[PDB]
Each structure stands twice: as structure tokens, then as C-alpha cells.
Amino acid sequence: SLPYWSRKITLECTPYPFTLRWEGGVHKDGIPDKVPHPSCDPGSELVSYT
Amino acid sequence: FTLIELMIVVAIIGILAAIAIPQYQNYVARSEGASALATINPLKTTVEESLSRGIAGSKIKIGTTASTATET
């Protein structure tokens, strides 16, 4: 048997994607319908966002 | 009472019932326009400010829904 030498090194990570969501809109006085599509009709506009 | 006083009163009534009345429509027609422009002119200042600051158009609206750093 004769001499010998070697080395090794590795780096890796596992995948795991995901998704997040969030909605919201402008607050109004006297509008209990907290929905992105306000079905009421007070007298203003609600841009909303989802 | 006599007829002289009654006839004089009747004549004075007819005399007073003769005052002319000129036109009075152009006055209001002009006052309405003098107020419309005076009310809707100052919006140009806000329009120019919003267009020169940085925000784009479209978002510029009317009403009373507060303000933020994007919409006017």
C-alpha cells in the first residue's frame, strides 16, 4: 500500500416554495359590508386591493 | 262718508297701479356664471401641483376621502 490523499466538500439546500396573500380597502362610516366588492351604495368610491 | 273721498281713493288706486317693472333675468343669469367660474377655477392650482410633484394623473379625483402620498 502506498500513500494517498483526497478531500471533498458539498453544499446544497432543499426547496419548499409557498405563497402569501392579503386584502384590504378604504374604511367608511356606516358600511358593515367588509368585502372587496362593496354591494352597498353610499356615495363614494372604494379602490380596494387583493 | 261721501262720494268725493271714495272716488278720489279709487282714482289714486288706479294711478298707483301703473308703476313699470323692468327686466331682472340677465342679472341672475350673469351672477350664476360669475359664481360658477369663481368656484371651479381654483382646482387648477391643485391639478398643477399634483402634475408637477410626481404622481401621475387619473388618480386625481374629487370628494372628501382624506389624502396620502400617492393619490390626491
Q: Which residue has the cell 439546500?
A: A13
The single-letter DSSP state of residue B69 is S
Residue in chain A closest to B71 (alpha carbons) equals A47
Chain B nearest C-alpha distance from A46 (Å): 10
Q: What is the resolution of this structure in A?
A: 7.9
Residues of chain A contacting residue B65, judged by C-beta atoms under 8 Å apart: 26, 44-45
CA distance A18 to A20: 7
Amino acid identity of residue B70, one-letter, is: T
How many CA atoms are closer than 13 Å to the CA of B51, on its beta-carbon side? 8
Residues of chain A contacting residue B61, judged by C-beta atoms under 8 Å apart: 45
In this complex, do B63 and A26 lie within 8 Å of one another by their Cβ atoms? no
Experimental approach was cryo-EM
Q: Which of B59, B70, B63, B46 is nearest to A28 (CA)?
A: B63
